Symmetry: C2
Subunit: 200 residues, 2 copies
Amino acid sequence: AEIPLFPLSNALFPAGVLRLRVFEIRYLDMVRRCIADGSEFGVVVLEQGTEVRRPDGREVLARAGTMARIDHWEAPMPALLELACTGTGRFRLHACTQGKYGLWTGQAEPVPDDAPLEVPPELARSASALGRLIARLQREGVPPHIMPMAAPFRLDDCGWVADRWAEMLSLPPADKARLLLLPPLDRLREIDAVLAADGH
Amino acid sequence: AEIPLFPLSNALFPAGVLRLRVFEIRYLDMVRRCIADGSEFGVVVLEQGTEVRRPDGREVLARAGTMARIDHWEAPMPALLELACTGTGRFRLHACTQGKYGLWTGQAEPVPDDAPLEVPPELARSASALGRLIARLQREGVPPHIMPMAAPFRLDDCGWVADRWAEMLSLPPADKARLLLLPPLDRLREIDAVLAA
């Protein structure tokens, strides 16, 4: 499924929050199309290279990604677009090409959402930790335009909880892409093995 | 104490890495002057505002921040100013003033860099977990200009450990500001509490 690609320094996960700020011509033209078009673009983390790369070149795109849906947009100044996208359906991009203005694109086969699971008591620490984080945000009165996570607080869900943590944890891009694809349970387990002292 | 301020969505901590893209020309005069005489600018996290500039809203700065040092600027894209910075000394922001063009300026009382202290056995959890994140990024050989933290990895320094977690974790801007000025021991204890409970 040939779709436009917006590689980024961080990976996007389903239901994930993402406030973009486009200034490059390739993304300015691409984002505007999607605005009038209605379609959404694909977001995959950069396993290598930067996200601007005007003089650069060697940039490696992750093999997995999540589709990005545009919620609302604004134009604070000319040649600048401030977006507030939401992560949608995930995909497993394969052979992609780099078109005009350096706009990445690739045929990507979607990957159906995983069935919602309950968080076992063997992984309560993470879900309880996360829940603690969200509590403070709310307790402090953090406005919507700053909240790093959407309203639907699926705290009692393996996948969801792991997606939230993988989003904010400084993990290698190559790992983030794998986590996105791995099954919900396995995903929570692994991040769990990162937050807790596995090997002291 | 009077210094220029650059508000950001994320708080900046000592030794914290920062890749800043400056769009609004209202800041050009600030970054240029800094680049010129090698000075620094203050970075405070926004409590109730947008990094860019809303015409219907006003920005509210946090109670503290950290000075930023320009490791070096670049302009890969025509006229786009992109610079790598590092958080240096912390300051307590007594008062700030928003003047013309929306530029912020405040009274910054610099606070001395805390002394380093070994990580106690109970707070070891927080250090080993970070240590693993770091070793994870290295095992994958993630490029330096991609890593969120800088080379000097002080895994036995409460302040360092706590600061890293504080900039990574999704916490309200006002809390980051508070933890920033908080003494090393208390900082770690507090971030440790969030990681468990």
